[PDB]
Write a protein that binds this ligand. Structure first.
Ligand SMILES: O=c1[nH]c(=O)n([C@@H]2O[C@H](CO)[C@H](O)[C@H]2O)cc1F
Ligand SMILES: O=c1[nH]c(=O)n([C@H]2O[C@@H](CO)[C@@H](O)[C@H]2O)cc1F
Ligand SMILES: [Cu+2]
Ligand SMILES: [Cu+2]
Ligand SMILES: [Zn+2]
Ligand SMILES: [Zn+2]
Lengths: 153, 153
């Protein structure tokens, strides 16, 4: 198996830890962990293109989109590779994450390692919000916390 | 060209920004930036195996060593891929980094992207310290600041 990890931090109270595991080369990737400090509700959750945090999370650029597609949800054919949808926090401010995705990878052209995982201000509308920005970012707003995805033991 | 970047942070005052640029696939990598908050003198400077900062910089593991060599300096044949020697801080606690290295890469088996860059407490003795640990870590002590190396625009 191949494994990766990401520590999420930002300028505010949001922080977390997300693990990735890919049992077979090019197979599905399990994504699991926990994010705290969040407002109750949905928070967009994406791999962005660059692993650059020079100026904070903004330096990561747009969503990771090697195939030059429009934004969508993880279940959609038409999505960015980095489109992992939303995490959902309760009143406790915690989202307990447990996803499997078959588009992201820990190897090859769709490898997310060395790129930035971001948790966003508000909901990702999965490309269904009815403006041009929906089909780019999902209208998920600002970047509360982020980290560079790294190779794990 | 291929580019990468690393933001160095830790639990104390040490922080910095380091850029990587590789003009050609097989070719040397230029490494430059700035680190502040240091004591005067040498601080070991290495790429460590894992891009895992879960528990802080300790989580990054040993020096990156895809060839199972012993520890040395960047100008030695016998070195870990991750052996970038020392940065040197003046009285103001700033080290101004500008080197070139032919062993690290931003692609392939020698790829440092997705791994952790670390600045250490103490001098790296470049494997010349006369003890077993010298040829493993260079006796560079604890990890003052680190970051995961990410793909840059
Ligand atoms: O060794 C270097 N040091 C350095 O500071 N740079 C910076 O990177 C830019 C050029 O790529 C700026 O000219 C310069 O400040 C590049 C280098 F290659
Ligand atoms: O939500 C989770 N999903 C999950 O797969 N795991 C586990 O995933 C396993 C991979 O076989 C373990 O590495 C363990 O981290 C833990 C979790 F909390
Ligand atoms: Cu995002
Ligand atoms: Cu080191
Ligand atoms: Zn997207
Ligand atoms: Zn070494």
């Amino acid at each position: 198996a191949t494994k990766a990890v990401c520590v999420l931090k930002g300028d505010g109270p949001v922080q977390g830890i997300i693990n990735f595991e890919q049992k077979e080369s090019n197979g599905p990737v399990k994504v699991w962990g926990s994010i705290k400090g969040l407002t109750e509700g949905l928070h967009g959750f994406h791999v962005h293109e660059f692993g650059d945090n020079t100026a904070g999370c903004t330096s990561a650029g747009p969503h990771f989109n090697p195939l030059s597609r429009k934004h969508g949800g993880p279940k959609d054919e038409e999505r960015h590779v980095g489109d992992l949808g939303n995490v959902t926090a309760d009143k406790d401010g915690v989202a307990d994450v447990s996803i499997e995705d078959s588009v992201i990878s820990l190897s090859g052209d769709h490898c997310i390692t060395g790129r930035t995982l971001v948790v966003h201000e508000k909901a990702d509308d999965l490309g269904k919000g009815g403006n041009e920005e929906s089909t780019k970012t999902g209208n998920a707003g600002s970047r509360l916390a982020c980290g560079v995805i790294g190779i794990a033991q």
